[PDB]
Design an enzyme around this catalytic site. Sequence first.
Site, PDB file in Angstrom:
ATOM      1  N   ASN A 176      48.246  90.044  59.307  1.00 56.62           N
ATOM      2  CA  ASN A 176      48.709  89.619  58.018  1.00 56.62           C
ATOM      3  C   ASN A 176      48.029  90.361  56.886  1.00 56.62           C
ATOM      4  O   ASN A 176      46.814  90.560  56.910  1.00 56.62           O
ATOM      5  CB  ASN A 176      48.480  88.100  57.869  1.00 56.62           C
ATOM      6  CG  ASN A 176      49.480  87.262  58.661  1.00 56.62           C
ATOM      7  OD1 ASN A 176      50.493  87.766  59.164  1.00 56.62           O
ATOM      8  ND2 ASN A 176      49.211  85.960  58.743  1.00 56.62           N
ATOM      9  N   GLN A 215      60.865  97.684  55.932  1.00 57.76           N
ATOM     10  CA  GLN A 215      61.623  96.756  56.719  1.00 57.76           C
ATOM     11  C   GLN A 215      63.013  96.575  56.101  1.00 57.76           C
ATOM     12  O   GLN A 215      63.368  97.209  55.099  1.00 57.76           O
ATOM     13  CB  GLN A 215      60.867  95.428  56.895  1.00 57.76           C
ATOM     14  CG  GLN A 215      60.768  94.531  55.655  1.00 57.76           C
ATOM     15  CD  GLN A 215      60.143  93.188  56.008  1.00 57.76           C
ATOM     16  OE1 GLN A 215      59.081  92.831  55.502  1.00 57.76           O
ATOM     17  NE2 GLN A 215      60.768  92.476  56.925  1.00 57.76           N
ATOM     18  N   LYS A 220      47.735  81.531  52.575  1.00 58.64           N
ATOM     19  CA  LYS A 220      49.145  81.149  52.523  1.00 58.64           C
ATOM     20  C   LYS A 220      49.434  80.428  51.210  1.00 58.64           C
ATOM     21  O   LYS A 220      50.564  80.479  50.687  1.00 58.64           O
ATOM     22  CB  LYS A 220      49.490  80.166  53.661  1.00 58.64           C
ATOM     23  CG  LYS A 220      48.980  80.517  55.025  1.00 58.64           C
ATOM     24  CD  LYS A 220      49.775  81.651  55.610  1.00 58.64           C
ATOM     25  CE  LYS A 220      49.024  82.958  55.520  1.00 58.64           C
ATOM     26  NZ  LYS A 220      49.679  83.941  56.420  1.00 58.64           N
ATOM     27  N   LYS A 247      51.691  89.642  47.472  1.00 57.28           N
ATOM     28  CA  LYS A 247      50.452  88.847  47.396  1.00 57.28           C
ATOM     29  C   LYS A 247      49.196  89.700  47.615  1.00 57.28           C
ATOM     30  O   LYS A 247      48.145  89.342  47.161  1.00 57.28           O
ATOM     31  CB  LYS A 247      50.492  87.705  48.415  1.00 57.28           C
ATOM     32  CG  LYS A 247      49.305  86.758  48.378  1.00 57.28           C
ATOM     33  CD  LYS A 247      49.306  85.891  49.624  1.00 57.28           C
ATOM     34  CE  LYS A 247      50.405  84.831  49.543  1.00 57.28           C
ATOM     35  NZ  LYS A 247      50.784  84.284  50.885  1.00 57.28           N
ATOM     36  N   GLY A 287      61.701  88.226  57.727  1.00 57.75           N
ATOM     37  CA  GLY A 287      60.501  87.749  58.448  1.00 57.75           C
ATOM     38  C   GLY A 287      59.744  88.946  58.985  1.00 57.75           C
ATOM     39  O   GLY A 287      60.323  90.013  59.102  1.00 57.75           O
ATOM     40  N   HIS A 288      58.446  88.777  59.260  1.00 60.00           N
ATOM     41  CA  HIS A 288      57.645  89.765  59.972  1.00 60.00           C
ATOM     42  C   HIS A 288      58.089  90.008  61.445  1.00 60.00           C
ATOM     43  O   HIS A 288      57.772  91.038  62.023  1.00 60.00           O
ATOM     44  CB  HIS A 288      56.116  89.493  59.809  1.00 60.00           C
ATOM     45  CG  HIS A 288      55.730  88.049  60.003  1.00 60.00           C
ATOM     46  ND1 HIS A 288      55.806  87.415  61.221  1.00 60.00           N
ATOM     47  CD2 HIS A 288      55.341  87.101  59.115  1.00 60.00           C
ATOM     48  CE1 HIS A 288      55.454  86.143  61.087  1.00 60.00           C
ATOM     49  NE2 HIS A 288      55.172  85.924  59.814  1.00 60.00           N
ATOM     50  N   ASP A 331      47.311  89.192  54.051  1.00 62.63           N
ATOM     51  CA  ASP A 331      46.412  88.190  53.426  1.00 62.63           C
ATOM     52  C   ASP A 331      45.126  87.884  54.231  1.00 62.63           C
ATOM     53  O   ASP A 331      44.192  87.272  53.711  1.00 62.63           O
ATOM     54  CB  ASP A 331      47.164  86.883  53.152  1.00 62.63           C
ATOM     55  CG  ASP A 331      47.683  86.218  54.435  1.00 62.63           C
ATOM     56  OD1 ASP A 331      46.991  85.339  54.980  1.00 62.63           O
ATOM     57  OD2 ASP A 331      48.761  86.597  54.913  1.00 62.63           O
TER      58      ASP A 331
HETATM   59  O1  LIG Z   1      59.747  89.334  56.038  1.00 63.87           O
HETATM   60  C1  LIG Z   1      58.512  89.281  55.960  1.00 63.87           C
HETATM   61  C2  LIG Z   1      57.819  88.076  55.791  1.00 63.87           C
HETATM   62  C3  LIG Z   1      56.431  88.090  55.697  1.00 63.87           C
HETATM   63  N1  LIG Z   1      55.734  89.338  55.766  1.00 63.87           N
HETATM   64  C4  LIG Z   1      54.239  89.365  55.669  1.00 63.87           C
HETATM   65  O2  LIG Z   1      53.755  88.736  56.869  1.00 63.87           O
HETATM   66  C5  LIG Z   1      52.404  88.269  56.608  1.00 63.87           C
HETATM   67  C6  LIG Z   1      52.360  86.744  56.949  1.00 63.87           C
HETATM   68  O3  LIG Z   1      53.395  86.000  56.364  1.00 63.87           O
HETATM   69  P1  LIG Z   1      53.119  84.536  55.744  1.00 63.87           P
HETATM   70  O4  LIG Z   1      54.331  83.955  55.155  1.00 63.87           O
HETATM   71  O5  LIG Z   1      51.899  84.699  54.904  1.00 63.87           O
HETATM   72  O6  LIG Z   1      52.678  83.687  57.084  1.00 63.87           O
HETATM   73  P2  LIG Z   1      53.648  82.856  58.092  1.00 63.87           P
HETATM   74  O7  LIG Z   1      54.731  83.753  58.528  1.00 63.87           O
HETATM   75  O8  LIG Z   1      53.980  81.508  57.531  1.00 63.87           O
HETATM   76  O9  LIG Z   1      52.583  82.556  59.254  1.00 63.87           O
HETATM   77  C7  LIG Z   1      52.038  83.688  60.028  1.00 63.87           C
HETATM   78  O10 LIG Z   1      50.619  83.672  59.775  1.00 63.87           O
HETATM   79  C8  LIG Z   1      49.928  82.495  60.275  1.00 63.87           C
HETATM   80  C9  LIG Z   1      48.465  82.833  60.149  1.00 63.87           C
HETATM   81  O11 LIG Z   1      48.081  82.751  58.775  1.00 63.87           O
HETATM   82  C10 LIG Z   1      50.289  82.173  61.747  1.00 63.87           C
HETATM   83  O12 LIG Z   1      49.718  80.928  62.123  1.00 63.87           O
HETATM   84  C11 LIG Z   1      51.815  82.146  61.929  1.00 63.87           C
HETATM   85  O13 LIG Z   1      52.208  81.883  63.265  1.00 63.87           O
HETATM   86  C12 LIG Z   1      52.387  83.491  61.497  1.00 63.87           C
HETATM   87  O14 LIG Z   1      53.812  83.492  61.701  1.00 63.87           O
HETATM   88  C13 LIG Z   1      52.120  88.525  55.137  1.00 63.87           C
HETATM   89  O15 LIG Z   1      51.487  89.798  55.022  1.00 63.87           O
HETATM   90  C14 LIG Z   1      53.524  88.613  54.542  1.00 63.87           C
HETATM   91  O16 LIG Z   1      53.519  89.386  53.334  1.00 63.87           O
HETATM   92  C15 LIG Z   1      56.439  90.543  55.957  1.00 63.87           C
HETATM   93  O17 LIG Z   1      55.915  91.665  56.021  1.00 63.87           O
HETATM   94  N2  LIG Z   1      57.818  90.464  56.045  1.00 63.87           N
END
Ligand SMILES: O=c1ccn([C@@H]2O[C@H](COP(=O)(O)OP(=O)(O)O[C@H]3O[C@H](CO)[C@@H](O)[C@H](O)[C@H]3O)[C@@H](O)[C@H]2O)c(=O)[nH]1
Length: 468
Positions: free
Chosen positions: A211, A154, A360, A88, A182-183, A213
Site C-alpha cells: 500500500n 491502471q 485508511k 493520499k 481496485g488494486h 499509505d
Molecule cells: O483502484 C485502486 C484502489 C486503491 N489503490 C491503492 O491501494 C492501496 C490500498 O487501498 P486502500 O483503500 O487504502 O485499502 P483497502 O483496499 O481498503 O484495504 C487494503 O489494505 C488493508 C491494509 O491496510 C488490507 O487489510 C486490505 O485487505 C487491503 O485490501 C492504496 O495505495 C490505494 O491508493 C490503487 O492503486 N488502485
Amino acid sequence: SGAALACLEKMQASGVEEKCIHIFLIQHALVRKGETGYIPEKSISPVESLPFLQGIETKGENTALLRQAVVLKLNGGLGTGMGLNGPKSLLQVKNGQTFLDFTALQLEHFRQVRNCNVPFMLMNSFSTSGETKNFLRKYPTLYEVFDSDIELMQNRVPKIRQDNFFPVTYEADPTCEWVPPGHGDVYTVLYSSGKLDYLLGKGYRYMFISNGDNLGATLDVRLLDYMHEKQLGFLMEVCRRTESDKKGGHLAYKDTRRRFVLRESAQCPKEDEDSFQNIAKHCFFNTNNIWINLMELKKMMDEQLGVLRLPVMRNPKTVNPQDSQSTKVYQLEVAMGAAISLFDRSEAVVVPRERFAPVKTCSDLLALRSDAYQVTEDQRLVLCEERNGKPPAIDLDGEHYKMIDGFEKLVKGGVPSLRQCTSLTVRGLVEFGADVSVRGNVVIKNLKEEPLIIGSGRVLDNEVVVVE
Ligand SMILES: O=c1ccn([C@@H]2O[C@H](COP(=O)(O)OP(=O)(O)O[C@H]3O[C@H](CO)[C@@H](O)[C@H](O)[C@H]3O)[C@@H](O)[C@H]2O)c(=O)[nH]1
C-alpha cells in the site's frame, strides 16, 4: 443489456484496455442480477492459526533471488474516505515529508546499502498520475525515468447507477463519472500493458507489492527466500489484528477442502459488522504486503486468457462522494489480496506489526503524524516500542473528523503526543493546541457549539473530558 453496451461504448471512448472492459462487463452482468459481492459470516470459518515469520525464516540470504525482485507501491486510489480527490501519498506525514518522500527515500536507502538497483514502480490511476509525476520532480532519479520505468497506469471504469446500471453522468464534474477498479486491477494491468513480459524478459521473477499509505512495508530477502523454497506463487503478510484494524480485510476459510478467503470491508453485509469487527475471532489482518511470483502469474494469465476470477465487490456510493444527495451508484472493484485462492501454491504468514503502519482514515493519519510512530534508519515508519505492538485506538467523531478539512481543525494548533496513549476518543468540535500529552485511555466530548480548545501543555492522563 442496454446498460452494458452503454458502459462498453463509454469505456472504449476513453481508451480503456480491452480485457478490462471484458472483465468489467462480466461483473456488470452479475451485479445487474443482484449480486451483492457479500461474504456472509455463515459462509466462512475463522483462521485459528498461522505460521509466524520467526519460525519460517533462516540465517543467510540468497542474493540471486533479490536480483530477481521488483518493487511496486500501489498509488491509484482516490482517498474519497478521507475527502480527497487525488493521491493520499502526497499527504504530509512528518517533517514536511509526504508518504511519497518516505517511499522515495526508503528505495534510495535500499539501493545504496545493498548496492543493487532494484526496479521500482508506482501503480497510478487517472486521478493520481499527474500530481504524482509533478511531485517527483524533487527526485530526479525517479522523474527522469517516470514514464518509461516507474509508472504503471491502471484502468478506469465508470460508476454505474444503482437503479438501471447505466454509467452515471455528472455534468458539473465528469471526472466523478469514473473510478479505478481496485488494486486487484494490478494483475491485468501488468499482463495487458506488457510490463509483465518486459520484467520476465530481463530475468525478474518476483514482485513485492504494498500500500502507498504503509510506510512500514519492507522487502525481506529472508521471506523471499522462504517463498521460493516452498515454491509459492503468492505470499500474503498478515498481522495479529489490533483494536485499530477496522477497515481493510481479514482472512477466513471456506470449504471439500479448505481454501483461504479474504473478506474486505466492502464484502461485509451490514448485519455482520459485529462479527467482522471481532478481532479475537478474525485475528489475522491483511497488511496488503504481498509477494508474487511473476512467472506463475504469467502462466495463470495465459491459462485463463487474461481473465482472473477475482471476486467483484459492489461498493455503493453517491457519484459525488461529498454530496449525499447526488445520484446513488455502485463501484465495481477487486482486491489484489483475493488472488490468495487463485494461485496454485499460496500462503499467509504472521509478520511483526512493525511492517504495517496503515493510513485508511484521518484517525490513522493522526497516529502516524504523532510521536506514536517513529522514523527508522532505513526510512520506514514504525510504531514506538512502548506501545508494545498495539497502536493507540483512535475514534474520531465521524460527523467532524472524517473529512481531512474537519481533521484539519483538530490538529491545527498541534498534533498531540500519543506514544503513551492506549485509546483516544473525540466527540464534537475539539481543537488541540501545542505540546499536549495524551496518556492511557482518554475521552474528549464537546457538547457546546464553540470549539473546545485543549490548552497548550495540557496533560490528559487516563482522563475523561466532557464540556457541556
Ligand atoms: O483502484 C485502486 C484502489 C486503491 N489503490 C491503492 O491501494 C492501496 C490500498 O487501498 P486502500 O483503500 O487504502 O485499502 P483497502 O483496499 O481498503 O484495504 C487494503 O489494505 C488493508 C491494509 O491496510 C488490507 O487489510 C486490505 O485487505 C487491503 O485490501 C492504496 O495505495 C490505494 O491508493 C490503487 O492503486 N488502485
